[PDB]
Amino acid sequence: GHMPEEVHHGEEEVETFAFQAEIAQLMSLIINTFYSNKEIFLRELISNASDALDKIRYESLTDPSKLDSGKELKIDIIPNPQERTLTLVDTGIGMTKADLINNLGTIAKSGTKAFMEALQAGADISMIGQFGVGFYSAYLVAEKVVVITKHNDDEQYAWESSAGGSFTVRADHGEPIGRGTKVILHLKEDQTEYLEERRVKEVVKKHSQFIGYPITLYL
Ligand SMILES: CC(C)c1cc(C(=O)N2Cc3ccccc3C2)c(O)cc1CC#N
């Protein structure tokens, strides 16, 4: 046999970018401070999932073909005690590559900035969703967050950040999710209570009791 060397690939498959400084300041703030009620992170994710589900639901009024990718609108929650992850998957509208990079790395600048200003003036962490940036509350409990997303008009993409100032984005060739978003939280060691059935049930019942979509726990 011969030994080729592929000196160049079709396109750079992993890209790394810095957050806007304001986004990174918030993330650093969130991942390092004490908050007495970190369970709000699940409310924030379920809230973003509900909106993504509304978005595909309303386009399905006008185009029934937008669900050939999946007709059930639902949220699933999967704690995995042995890999210390908690996973939320929704069948909402998902995100193109352009919006993945933009929404999470860049145009969150306004909301994160107004929020840190509001914090200086007396706000607290639970109000983060009033500024459109509730997703970053995941770092209350996670040391590392992964986002897998699939929009009807694009391929599947993976996003990842450990809150070190940077994130990466790559074409994800993994479990095809069809459509929507999947979030994988790599939990801090002192936050393993969100891998128990009792507790996750408490948090959903306490905060997301009136979401208009089924939420299913896969213990
Ligand atoms: C990465 C975060 C921000 C996230 C994004 C989506 C998502 O694809 N959209 C698309 C869309 C369209 C309209 C209104 C809102 C949304 C949010 C999701 O379904 C779940 C999460 C998890 C959290 N928190």
GROMACS .gro file of C-alpha atoms and ligand atoms in nm:
model
  243
    1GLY     CA    1   0.000   0.000   0.000
    2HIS     CA    2   0.090   0.365  -0.059
    3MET     CA    3   0.074   0.651   0.197
    4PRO     CA    4  -0.099   0.968   0.077
    5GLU     CA    5  -0.100   1.280   0.294
    6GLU     CA    6  -0.408   1.499   0.272
    7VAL     CA    7  -0.240   1.840   0.292
    8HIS     CA    8  -0.572   2.026   0.270
    9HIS     CA    9  -0.936   1.954   0.355
   10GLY     CA   10  -1.256   2.063   0.183
   11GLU     CA   11  -1.310   2.336   0.442
   12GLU     CA   12  -1.196   2.408   0.799
   13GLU     CA   13  -1.431   2.187   0.998
   14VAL     CA   14  -1.373   2.347   1.344
   15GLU     CA   15  -1.378   2.724   1.397
   16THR     CA   16  -1.298   2.909   1.721
   17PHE     CA   17  -1.423   3.261   1.799
   18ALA     CA   18  -1.409   3.499   2.092
   19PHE     CA   19  -1.731   3.622   2.245
   20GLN     CA   20  -1.797   3.991   2.244
   21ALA     CA   21  -1.627   4.112   2.562
   22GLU     CA   22  -1.962   4.194   2.726
   23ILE     CA   23  -2.090   3.840   2.666
   24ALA     CA   24  -1.768   3.701   2.818
   25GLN     CA   25  -1.794   3.934   3.120
   26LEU     CA   26  -2.145   3.807   3.190
   27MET     CA   27  -2.038   3.443   3.146
   28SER     CA   28  -1.743   3.494   3.377
   29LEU     CA   29  -1.973   3.664   3.626
   30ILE     CA   30  -2.234   3.386   3.603
   31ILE     CA   31  -1.993   3.093   3.629
   32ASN     CA   32  -1.806   3.243   3.924
   33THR     CA   33  -2.066   3.399   4.151
   34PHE     CA   34  -2.285   3.253   4.418
   35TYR     CA   35  -2.655   3.253   4.350
   36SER     CA   36  -2.890   3.105   4.609
   37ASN     CA   37  -3.137   2.954   4.361
   38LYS     CA   38  -2.942   2.819   4.064
   39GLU     CA   39  -3.240   2.600   3.963
   40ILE     CA   40  -3.360   2.895   3.751
   41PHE     CA   41  -3.126   2.773   3.476
   42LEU     CA   42  -3.380   2.508   3.380
   43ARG     CA   43  -3.660   2.765   3.362
   44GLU     CA   44  -3.448   2.971   3.122
   45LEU     CA   45  -3.371   2.680   2.889
   46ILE     CA   46  -3.729   2.554   2.890
   47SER     CA   47  -3.833   2.911   2.813
   48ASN     CA   48  -3.607   2.930   2.507
   49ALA     CA   49  -3.726   2.586   2.394
   50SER     CA   50  -4.093   2.688   2.423
   51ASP     CA   51  -4.027   2.991   2.200
   52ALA     CA   52  -3.844   2.784   1.941
   53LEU     CA   53  -4.143   2.549   1.945
   54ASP     CA   54  -4.385   2.838   1.899
   55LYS     CA   55  -4.178   2.955   1.602
   56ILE     CA   56  -4.201   2.630   1.405
   57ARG     CA   57  -4.561   2.589   1.520
   58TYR     CA   58  -4.662   2.920   1.365
   59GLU     CA   59  -4.481   2.856   1.036
   60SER     CA   60  -4.653   2.515   1.029
   61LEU     CA   61  -4.984   2.701   1.011
   62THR     CA   62  -4.871   2.843   0.676
   63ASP     CA   63  -4.649   2.554   0.557
   64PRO     CA   64  -4.737   2.199   0.673
   65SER     CA   65  -4.420   2.089   0.492
   66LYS     CA   66  -4.204   2.246   0.764
   67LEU     CA   67  -4.272   1.936   0.975
   68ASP     CA   68  -4.157   1.666   0.733
   69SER     CA   69  -3.859   1.697   0.969
   70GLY     CA   70  -4.080   1.604   1.268
   71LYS     CA   71  -4.445   1.659   1.362
   72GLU     CA   72  -4.423   1.635   1.744
   73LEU     CA   73  -4.351   1.954   1.940
   74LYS     CA   74  -4.198   1.851   2.273
   75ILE     CA   75  -3.917   1.899   2.523
   76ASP     CA   76  -3.719   1.607   2.664
   77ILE     CA   77  -3.485   1.612   2.964
   78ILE     CA   78  -3.218   1.346   3.002
   79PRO     CA   79  -3.000   1.334   3.315
   80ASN     CA   80  -2.695   1.109   3.277
   81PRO     CA   81  -2.536   1.049   3.619
   82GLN     CA   82  -2.234   0.857   3.486
   83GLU     CA   83  -2.122   1.129   3.242
   84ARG     CA   84  -2.243   1.409   3.473
   85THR     CA   85  -2.446   1.573   3.199
   86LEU     CA   86  -2.800   1.700   3.180
   87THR     CA   87  -2.946   1.724   2.829
   88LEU     CA   88  -3.247   1.917   2.701
   89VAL     CA   89  -3.369   1.846   2.349
   90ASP     CA   90  -3.654   2.029   2.177
   91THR     CA   91  -3.817   1.983   1.838
   92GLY     CA   92  -3.849   2.358   1.782
   93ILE     CA   93  -3.734   2.555   1.484
   94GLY     CA   94  -3.362   2.520   1.543
   95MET     CA   95  -3.087   2.750   1.425
   96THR     CA   96  -2.891   2.795   1.106
   97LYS     CA   97  -2.513   2.809   1.133
   98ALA     CA   98  -2.531   3.187   1.075
   99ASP     CA   99  -2.768   3.235   1.369
  100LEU     CA  100  -2.586   2.988   1.594
  101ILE     CA  101  -2.261   3.192   1.573
  102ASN     CA  102  -2.440   3.525   1.570
  103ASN     CA  103  -2.697   3.470   1.847
  104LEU     CA  104  -2.464   3.307   2.098
  105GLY     CA  105  -2.137   3.483   2.020
  106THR     CA  106  -2.221   3.833   1.909
  107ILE     CA  107  -2.567   3.997   1.905
  108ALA     CA  108  -2.629   3.893   2.265
  109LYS     CA  109  -2.401   4.194   2.330
  110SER     CA  110  -2.691   4.434   2.391
  111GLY     CA  111  -2.880   4.211   2.633
  112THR     CA  112  -2.574   4.108   2.832
  113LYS     CA  113  -2.461   4.470   2.858
  114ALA     CA  114  -2.799   4.603   2.975
  115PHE     CA  115  -2.814   4.314   3.218
  116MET     CA  116  -2.477   4.379   3.382
  117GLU     CA  117  -2.582   4.743   3.406
  118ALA     CA  118  -2.909   4.636   3.563
  119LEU     CA  119  -2.712   4.412   3.804
  120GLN     CA  120  -2.496   4.703   3.914
  121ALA     CA  121  -2.811   4.902   3.988
  122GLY     CA  122  -2.977   4.633   4.202
  123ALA     CA  123  -3.105   4.353   3.977
  124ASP     CA  124  -3.031   3.989   4.053
  125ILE     CA  125  -2.967   3.679   3.844
  126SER     CA  126  -3.328   3.559   3.824
  127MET     CA  127  -3.417   3.852   3.593
  128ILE     CA  128  -3.173   3.750   3.318
  129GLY     CA  129  -3.453   3.631   3.087
  130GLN     CA  130  -3.604   3.980   3.085
  131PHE     CA  131  -3.291   4.073   2.889
  132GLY     CA  132  -3.313   3.795   2.630
  133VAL     CA  133  -2.991   3.627   2.747
  134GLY     CA  134  -3.124   3.359   2.981
  135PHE     CA  135  -2.928   3.088   2.798
  136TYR     CA  136  -2.606   3.191   2.972
  137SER     CA  137  -2.763   3.102   3.308
  138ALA     CA  138  -2.667   2.744   3.213
  139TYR     CA  139  -2.322   2.828   3.351
  140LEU     CA  140  -2.470   2.863   3.699
  141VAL     CA  141  -2.456   2.482   3.703
  142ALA     CA  142  -2.239   2.377   3.407
  143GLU     CA  143  -1.867   2.404   3.356
  144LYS     CA  144  -1.913   2.332   2.985
  145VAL     CA  145  -2.214   2.370   2.757
  146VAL     CA  146  -2.270   2.210   2.416
  147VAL     CA  147  -2.549   2.315   2.176
  148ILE     CA  148  -2.652   2.089   1.884
  149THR     CA  149  -2.893   2.245   1.642
  150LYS     CA  150  -3.068   2.164   1.315
  151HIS     CA  151  -3.280   2.408   1.116
  152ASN     CA  152  -3.482   2.306   0.812
  153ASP     CA  153  -3.273   2.533   0.590
  154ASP     CA  154  -2.924   2.421   0.701
  155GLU     CA  155  -2.720   2.124   0.819
  156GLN     CA  156  -2.671   2.016   1.179
  157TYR     CA  157  -2.413   2.216   1.374
  158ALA     CA  158  -2.243   2.186   1.712
  159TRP     CA  159  -2.153   2.479   1.940
  160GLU     CA  160  -1.944   2.452   2.256
  161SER     CA  161  -1.795   2.676   2.524
  162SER     CA  162  -1.635   2.635   2.866
  163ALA     CA  163  -1.669   3.009   2.936
  164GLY     CA  164  -1.301   3.073   2.874
  165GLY     CA  165  -1.366   3.368   2.642
  166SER     CA  166  -1.420   3.149   2.336
  167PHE     CA  167  -1.654   2.906   2.168
  168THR     CA  168  -1.617   2.668   1.879
  169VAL     CA  169  -1.858   2.570   1.606
  170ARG     CA  170  -1.836   2.260   1.392
  171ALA     CA  171  -2.047   2.061   1.152
  172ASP     CA  172  -2.183   1.789   1.380
  173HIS     CA  173  -2.196   1.443   1.228
  174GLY     CA  174  -2.367   1.276   1.522
  175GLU     CA  175  -2.716   1.153   1.617
  176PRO     CA  176  -2.944   1.327   1.364
  177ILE     CA  177  -3.200   1.526   1.565
  178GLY     CA  178  -3.419   1.605   1.262
  179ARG     CA  179  -3.504   1.958   1.370
  180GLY     CA  180  -3.459   2.171   1.675
  181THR     CA  181  -3.198   2.215   1.942
  182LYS     CA  182  -3.026   1.993   2.198
  183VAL     CA  183  -2.833   2.138   2.491
  184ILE     CA  184  -2.584   1.932   2.688
  185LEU     CA  185  -2.480   2.068   3.026
  186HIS     CA  186  -2.156   1.931   3.172
  187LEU     CA  187  -2.239   1.993   3.539
  188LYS     CA  188  -2.003   2.124   3.805
  189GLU     CA  189  -1.924   1.865   4.074
  190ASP     CA  190  -2.124   2.054   4.339
  191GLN     CA  191  -2.430   2.067   4.112
  192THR     CA  192  -2.497   1.691   4.069
  193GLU     CA  193  -2.841   1.732   4.227
  194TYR     CA  194  -2.980   1.807   3.880
  195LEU     CA  195  -2.918   1.444   3.784
  196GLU     CA  196  -3.176   1.310   4.030
  197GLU     CA  197  -3.539   1.248   3.938
  198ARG     CA  198  -3.694   1.402   4.249
  199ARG     CA  199  -3.512   1.733   4.206
  200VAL     CA  200  -3.559   1.787   3.830
  201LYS     CA  201  -3.927   1.707   3.879
  202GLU     CA  202  -3.942   1.968   4.158
  203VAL     CA  203  -3.781   2.232   3.937
  204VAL     CA  204  -4.006   2.177   3.633
  205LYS     CA  205  -4.319   2.170   3.848
  206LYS     CA  206  -4.206   2.486   4.031
  207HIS     CA  207  -4.101   2.701   3.730
  208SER     CA  208  -4.231   2.562   3.399
  209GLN     CA  209  -4.577   2.441   3.504
  210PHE     CA  210  -4.761   2.632   3.229
  211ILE     CA  211  -4.547   2.568   2.921
  212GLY     CA  212  -4.767   2.468   2.629
  213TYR     CA  213  -4.570   2.158   2.529
  214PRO     CA  214  -4.507   1.815   2.685
  215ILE     CA  215  -4.193   1.789   2.899
  216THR     CA  216  -4.068   1.433   2.942
  217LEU     CA  217  -3.807   1.314   3.193
  218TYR     CA  218  -3.587   1.022   3.080
  219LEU     CA  219  -3.442   0.913   3.416
  220LIG     C1  220  -2.882   2.800   2.256
  220LIG     C2  221  -3.010   2.849   2.329
  220LIG     C3  222  -3.028   3.004   2.311
  220LIG     C4  223  -3.133   2.775   2.273
  220LIG     C5  224  -3.178   2.807   2.145
  220LIG     C6  225  -3.290   2.737   2.093
  220LIG     C7  226  -3.341   2.769   1.952
  220LIG     O1  227  -3.316   2.697   1.859
  220LIG     N1  228  -3.415   2.889   1.931
  220LIG     C8  229  -3.464   2.929   1.802
  220LIG     C9  230  -3.568   3.037   1.833
  220LIG    C10  231  -3.659   3.098   1.744
  220LIG    C11  232  -3.748   3.196   1.798
  220LIG    C12  233  -3.744   3.230   1.931
  220LIG    C13  234  -3.654   3.169   2.018
  220LIG    C14  235  -3.563   3.069   1.965
  220LIG    C15  236  -3.453   2.985   2.033
  220LIG    C16  237  -3.357   2.636   2.168
  220LIG     O2  238  -3.469   2.574   2.103
  220LIG    C17  239  -3.314   2.604   2.295
  220LIG    C18  240  -3.201   2.672   2.350
  220LIG    C19  241  -3.152   2.633   2.494
  220LIG    C20  242  -3.165   2.748   2.592
  220LIG     N2  243  -3.176   2.835   2.664
   0.00000   0.00000   0.00000
